[PDB]
């Protein structure tokens with residue numbers, strides 16, 4: 105399965121896809137009592153739909169992703185309501201020692217009082233302390249669902265995300281953009297790469313006509 | 325895959341595409357416990373479990389695309405299911421074909437009518453024909469299609485694509501594969517159920533057994 | 543508040559939750575010049591979720607063909623009059639001759655109008671005959687034309703209502719639903735003048751609300 | 755109406771559109787008569803005709819710990835606006851369970867010590883957070899060390915149908931105790947503004963176990 109590594113331990117992996125660029129063409133064409141034509145006319149229809157704001161045809165393309173991301177990223181991500189999610193449960197599972205530790209380069213462009221290496225160090229220290237406490241509470245008989253509340257927001261979680269191309273393009277608009285947090289931008293770049301490989305005509309037409317973000321026009 | 329079931333006199337339900345299968349639900353559900361697939365026994369059991377306890381979100385990862393040909397009055401009820409995606413034939417843009425649902429005499433079974441059921445059938449096809457011929461005359465006269473079509477009756481056939489996940493599809497079946505629904509949409513719901521059963525047999529069997537609220541599938 | 547649309551149609555406001563300050567409170571997560579400024583700011587920058595906390599209920603009487611276009615807006619709630627159960631009323635949208643202005647037609651506009659009324663009358667008379675014969679209503683009604691009036695309750699938040707106005711208060715939309723959209727817009731402006739003003743200025747994608 | 759929940763939490767009613775009669779008006783499609791209107795409400799609820807209840811809408815203002823909010827926010831048929839850790843300096847407010855939260859569980863240390871241990875890490879994480887901020891580290895990065903029991907605040911706009919689903923699932927002994935407590939608050943307010951719908955819900959549609967016992 106197409107699998108892209110993000111951050112220090114994160115990833116985005118394509119589990120499944122229904123349909124392709126031509127799923128959008130077939131759906132749009134029914135309006136005119138038509139179906140598919142030639143490659144040239146069909147690709148141009150996709151561009152036509154994107155340039156004029158016909159978004160519903162792209163709902164017939166659907167993806168399922170498997171994502172590992174820090175909780176603070178997942179919290180932003182799961183704000184996208186037009187999608188389906190299933191997530192690893194801190195209530196039911198003993199959580200693994202896996203946390204996002206920013207690299208020193210993460211603080212490029214910020215004048216900092218202490219070296220970036222020290223920032224990285226201080227984050228790690230809280231992480232180890234919290235995790236040790238989490239395991240101590242569990243070992244003492246403290247229910248998992250309570251023990252986990254001391255764990256920090258950089259804890260990695262895992263989830264399945266099923267989402268259609270229209271909602272995926274909203275996601276890219278809002279998250280593949282320099283206003284979203286850098287961490288989620290990185291995940292959105294991987295989503296974009298998988299989308300482009302499966303639906304190249306829709307992706308290129310989106311970038312050309314419909315996409316509102318900045319970064320995907322800059323970064324291949 | 326590809327499945328097609330003819331419904332009423334001229335209608336159909338055709339499966340255009342599917343994403344996932346019963347194991348798609350098993351995998352999504354198992355992530356909760358930091359697990360994946362296991363054996364057929366334990367995974368079939370899990371699907372029954374999910375269905376018994378009303379854990380419906382794992383089934384959203386199973387997705388269907390249907391191509392449907394149905395009368396407008398059927399489509400009108402169907403399109404009330406908002407948790408799904410639609411694209412439909414446009415009267416504003418297309419010259420509409422002479423295809424209308426004409427009930428068969430048997431459709432009045434159990435109804436004592438003043439005129440022979442065959443006559444009811446006849447009367448329906450007569451009005452449909454008059455309406456259609458008026459539509460064509462207006463079109464030939466240069467009336468925009470979006471206006472001409474307003475004289476067309478509710479038994480005109482339309483066509484649409486429907487993308488829907490297994491959870492919404494189970495909701496559709498609870499409501500439409502039921503005696504209280506109109507017989508015509510029941511028939512479409514029966515075809516949707518047959519296709520669902522074929523592609524997701526474990527989910528369907530568990531649905532019938534533990535969650536399905538209607539009366540016609542059982 | 544009620545606006546008559548078409549020959550027999552209308553849009554009336556049944557209820558509303560909130561005003562422009564509802565979006566301001568949601569955006570700030572708490573609880574006059576700076577508050578209007580925040581509304582324009584949110585609108586200019588595409589921050590739409592705060593407008594979801596303003597909600598309207600409309601009662602709408604409209605031809606079925608208009609309602610079918612309308613009910614494609616999935617992010618909203620609907621309850622509609624039942625034709626399976628209710629004997630349906632003799633009310634149909636008959637276009638005025640002026641509806642065909644611009645179109646060079648082989649039949650005079652007034653004659654097209656007349657041809658539509660005729661079908662409506664014959665269709666309704668067939669429906670009534672069937673019901674009289676003991677044909678169930680849910681079957682008898684299938685002969686009724688797409689211009690039959692129906693009524694529905696529509697509950698929709700301001701964000702989805704702005705999406706509706708972007709698509710339907712626009713010259714690409716069918717003229718008949720444009721008229722309805724103009725009415726919805728007028729009510730929206732009454733209740734949420736700051737949001738409506740900023741919407742027009744910064745976010746609205748249609749054309750007719752800039753002209754009318 | 756504002757109800758305190760947990761140690762620093764609350765559920766506050768901000769607005770409401772409609773009342774029980776809004777569902778009746780929608781069901782009948784008509785812009786009253788108590789017994790026949792209550793009877794309709796019960797009929798709809800009994801036969802699962804739930805769409806008329808979507809025309810009653812609530813706005814709440816809720817203060818809750820992030821681990822509770824993450825569960826809450828899985829309810830997609832609703833609208834949310836939340837205090838932003840990326841843009842605001844976060845307040846020293848964290849949920850620390852009472853010893854009675856863990857009484858019942860046989861634990862190897864006193865519950866009192868479980869409280870102390872939890873409080874200790876909270877305090878350490880918060881201190882590091884403030885240090886990093888003071889150092890010039892972006893808020894968005896500095897906050898990643900804060901634990902899941904940090905309090906957040908959001909506006910929630912939800913219709914009565916979706917709110918009844920939320921009660922089915924959360925006002926229930928399988929939901930985490932913390933979110934149960936919020937659900938009881940939501941239910942009390944819903945009962946106050948929509949008494950006939952709430953009664954009919956309990957009698958016919960409610961699938962949980964706590965609201966019939968409390």
Ligand SMILES: Cc1cc2nc3c(=O)[nH]c(=O)nc-3n(C[C@H](O)[C@H](O)[C@H](O)COP(=O)(O)OP(=O)(O)OC[C@H]3O[C@@H](n4cnc5c(N)ncnc54)[C@H](O)[C@@H]3O)c2cc1C
Pocket residue numbers: 183184185186187271274278279283284285591594617699701702705831832833834835836837838
């Ligand atoms: C840079 C940035 C900063 C942000 N800051 C904050 C913040 O400070 N606080 C905060 O709470 N959130 C914040 N968000 C989250 C934001 O408010 C949205 O919750 C999130 O981006 C999901 O957007 P969406 O509603 O467009 O997507 P979805 O929820 O997936 O919805 C997709 C589309 O369907 C529609 N839709 C779905 N449900 C509804 C509905 N109930 N009503 C009307 N339309 C609906 C809309 O058209 C929407 O575009 C931020 C997002 C970004 C990118």
Ligand SMILES: Cc1cc2nc3c(=O)[nH]c(=O)nc-3n(C[C@H](O)[C@H](O)[C@H](O)COP(=O)(O)OP(=O)(O)OC[C@H]3O[C@@H](n4cnc5c(N)ncnc54)[C@H](O)[C@@H]3O)c2cc1C
Pocket residue numbers: 186187188189190191192193196356381384407489491492828829830831832916919923924928929930
């Ligand atoms: C005790 C308990 C344990 C849980 N454990 C986990 C877990 O381990 N992992 C995990 O990921 N989640 C878990 N959840 C969350 C659960 O999976 C749902 O996300 C949550 O209950 C919201 O439910 P909902 O979909 O009914 O509500 P909403 O998202 O508000 O949706 C409301 C209704 O609309 C429908 N609906 C909305 N969107 C769609 C859609 N895209 N497709 C089909 N139908 C739709 C359904 O009819 C649904 O009832 C748990 C919840 C409870 C109460």
Ligand SMILES: Cc1cc2nc3c(=O)[nH]c(=O)nc-3n(C[C@H](O)[C@H](O)[C@H](O)COP(=O)(O)OP(=O)(O)OC[C@H]3O[C@@H](n4cnc5c(N)ncnc54)[C@H](O)[C@@H]3O)c2cc1C
Pocket residue numbers: 404405406407408492495499500504505506617618619620621622623624805808831913915916
């Ligand atoms: C026998 C029968 C008779 C009917 N008679 C009438 C009638 O007389 N008049 C009429 O108007 N309709 C009528 N309907 C339609 C009915 O009211 C629903 O519109 C239709 O059945 C769709 O059901 P749904 O809302 O559950 O499905 P969807 O709209 O697909 O929604 C699926 C699920 O998601 C949820 N959901 C989706 N959107 C929202 C939302 N905005 N708020 C809260 N929850 C949401 C609900 O949990 C719902 O079960 C009838 C249906 C049947 C089967």
Ligand SMILES: Cc1cc2nc3c(=O)[nH]c(=O)nc-3n(C[C@H](O)[C@H](O)[C@H](O)COP(=O)(O)OP(=O)(O)OC[C@H]3O[C@@H](n4cnc5c(N)ncnc54)[C@H](O)[C@@H]3O)c2cc1C
Pocket residue numbers: 135160163186268270271407408409410411412413414614615616617618702705709710714715716
């Ligand atoms: C001029 C014109 C011509 C049209 N022609 C046709 C035609 O020929 N055939 C046809 O079938 N329809 C046609 N439509 C209808 C159109 O495709 C939409 O169904 C309708 O405009 C509703 O728009 P919407 O989905 O944005 O609104 P809603 O359905 O209310 O949704 C609101 C927003 O939330 C989002 N959303 C809701 N559900 C989903 C979802 N399941 N997946 C992804 N995002 C979602 C999107 O952000 C959407 O903008 C036409 C509309 C217009 C204005």
Ligand SMILES: O=c1ccn([C@H]2C[C@H](O)[C@@H](COP(=O)(O)O)O2)c(=O)[nH]1
Pocket residue numbers: 191192193194195196821824825826828928929930
């Ligand atoms: O009772 C529960 C358990 C889990 N989840 C959802 C919320 C999170 O998105 C994810 C894991 O939650 P926790 O188990 O970590 O609380 O699944 C809930 O919504 N309710």
Ligand SMILES: O=c1ccn([C@H]2C[C@H](O)[C@@H](COP(=O)(O)O)O2)c(=O)[nH]1
Pocket residue numbers: 397400401402404504505506622623624625626627
């Ligand atoms: O069995 C039914 C009856 C009604 N409706 C909805 C669809 C329409 O929007 C409206 C009226 O439908 P008819 O009763 O006219 O079919 O209510 C259904 O979905 N199913």
Ligand SMILES: O=c1ccn([C@H]2C[C@H](O)[C@@H](COP(=O)(O)O)O2)c(=O)[nH]1
Pocket residue numbers: 412413414415416417607610611612614714715716
């Ligand atoms: O302007 C339009 C054209 C089409 N449709 C949708 C509504 C119907 O579901 C279908 C066909 O509509 P008509 O063209 O026949 O109105 O496409 C709209 O919503 N608006």
Ligand SMILES: O=c1ccn([C@H]2C[C@H](O)[C@@H](COP(=O)(O)O)O2)c(=O)[nH]1
Pocket residue numbers: 176179180181183283284285836837838839840841
């Ligand atoms: O860039 C952002 C900022 C905020 N939020 C949402 C997610 C949370 O529900 C809430 C606060 O997020 P934080 O700012 O704390 O990350 O707003 C986002 O979705 N994206």
